[PDB]
Amino acid sequence: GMETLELQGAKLRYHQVGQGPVLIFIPGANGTGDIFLPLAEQLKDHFTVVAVDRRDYGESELTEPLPDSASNPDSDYRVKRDAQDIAELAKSLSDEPVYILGSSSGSIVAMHVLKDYPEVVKKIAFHEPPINTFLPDSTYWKDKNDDIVHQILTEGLEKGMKTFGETLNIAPIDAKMMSQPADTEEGRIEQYKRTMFWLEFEIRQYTHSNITLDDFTKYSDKITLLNGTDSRGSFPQDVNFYINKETGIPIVDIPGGHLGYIQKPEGFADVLLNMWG
Amino acid sequence: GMETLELQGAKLRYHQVGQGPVLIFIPGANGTGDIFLPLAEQLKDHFTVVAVDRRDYGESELTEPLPDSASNPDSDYRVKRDAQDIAELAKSLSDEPVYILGSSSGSIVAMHVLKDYPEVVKKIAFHEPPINTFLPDSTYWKDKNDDIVHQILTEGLEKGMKTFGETLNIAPIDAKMMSQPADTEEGRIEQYKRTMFWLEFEIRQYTHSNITLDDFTKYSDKITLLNGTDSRGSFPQDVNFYINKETGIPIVDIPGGHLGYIQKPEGFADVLLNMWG
Ligand SMILES: *[P@@](=O)(CCCCCCCCCCOC(=O)NCCC#C)OCC
Ligand SMILES: *[P@@](=O)(CCCCCCCCCCOC(=O)NCCC#C)OCC
Ligand SMILES: [Mg+2]
Ligand SMILES: [Mg+2]
Ligand SMILES: [Mg+2]
């Protein structure tokens, strides 16, 4: 199995092959050390080859969640923590400074290892680095990076959620309220994370989950179906109409739309009290 | 200030307001009980209102990671676990069966509570459920959900990375290797998750991190820059050309492209051995 070095906030997993001075390979965007294993076989007679899964990837595991600020595009948390991981790995395996090669974003990690832990570096190689900060045209490349992230993550989510609302014929008031950006910047990054979590881990799994009509008929006397007065024509109401058609379970109309419990709390409460008070 | 019930794998947090029989509100996609607080204020002289942050949201906190299979679209782990949370919460607050209302995906949780733990339910309400499984046109609705999720989580990245690779003049063989789809559905899910993470948390933060030419000149004797022979004309090589022009640190040419260490491991190793062996 993969070797483990337990570090602050993570278990760092790495491959180790060969004998001799330590040579650490730092992966780029794939994040994992397995991409260097064919190369390690060629070098194993001359170096103790160490191919790292950086802490956010592969078989490595965080022992606590990323700090909230890591989402900031100018955060230095992850790159410095990756560099410290490499320095601690070097120190755990070798009394002498070590050889280090990084490729792509792994070469940027390697740069920070040299900057902040030069004492661990015997020789270092930067294979095809994509860092732009010191270039004369840094702004052009930084803007392209910022733009592509915004297109994939922000625009992609915004356009998909608008389509979702149209597909389910969500009433305009309800779609507005569900899409409103949070009043607090803290709440805005939390809202992106929550929406993407619901998208990946909830919507498909729950909407196609294992409920049958017979599950409703078995305890039908306990069930009320609720449709909002302000969300007519929407898909969730059609679900209730079908349950009612097939089971006879009654539909009670209640103020507000899809979010009527917050849109019209007094009127929503009055119906609940009629039902159960 | 919210209340806590510690369950298997999570600390479940909830608002509790009022006096009377227990009434549990289960939120939908927003995941948090605060959306029910204005309604709770209207009901607090009639019910002990309990408004849940479902375990993956809000002030609730997981105490063990989600199963790896939770990202699978047909997973039932989360919906069953949410339903068990409601049943255990009900048992912890009341010796009698309780009133339960869910809305949206929270109404699907409520359906699973009735199916798996009917003994805790006195009366239950399903407000605007978006479940499709038992509908006569379930295929239409299920496929629409799957398609919109696939567009956000995978297709935006596919289209955007292809344009981005063109902007950076990435060699065709590197772009194909970097975008090659894994051979299993689970492997492809993991691949897209990893690239979405790299896009949000790595590309901007690392490529605009605080490295200057002065960082290289302090330790210039230790540094080799590596350019692939099959990746000429690409942006990362221009980064190395600029470092070398300003600092004199040598460029060594090495076989393969951006991914040369795995494309041509023997030729790559030979250069490393000439450099450092
Ligand atoms: P339920 O679990 C239903 C939750 C949404 C189901 C599809 C309706 C589409 C919502 C309209 C899209 O607007 C947004 O939600 N905001 C995202 C905007 C961006 C970016 O939960 C009810 C609470
Ligand atoms: P370095 O950290 C890569 C530096 C940026 C390289 C640009 C990538 C060009 C797109 C190719 C990647 O394709 C995908 O990842 N997704 C498939 C979508 C399509 C098409 O790391 C090198 C290991
Ligand atoms: Mg240029
Ligand atoms: Mg009344
Ligand atoms: Mg696809």
Curated annotation (Swiss-Prot), chains A, B:
GO cellular component terms given for this protein: membrane
Location of the AB hydrolase-1 domain: 21-138
Keyword flag Membrane: no
Enzyme superclass (EC): hydrolase
SUPFAM superfamilies given in the database record: alpha/beta-Hydrolases (SSF53474)
Coiled-coil positions: none
Superkingdom in the source lineage: Bacteria
Keyword Metal-binding: no
Alphabetic keyword roster: Hydrolase
Enzyme Commission designation: 3.-.-.-
Disordered: annotated span: 58-77
InterPro entries: AB_hydrolase_1 (IPR000073), AB_hydrolase_fold (IPR029058), AB_hydrolase_sf (IPR050266)
GO-annotated molecular function: hydrolase activity
Protein family: Belongs to the AB hydrolase superfamily.
PANTHER family (alphabetical): HYDROLASE, PUTATIVE (AFU_ORTHOLOGUE AFUA_2G14860)-RELATED (PTHR43798:SF33), MONOACYLGLYCEROL LIPASE (PTHR43798)
Protein name, UniProt field: Uncharacterized hydrolase SAUSA300_2518
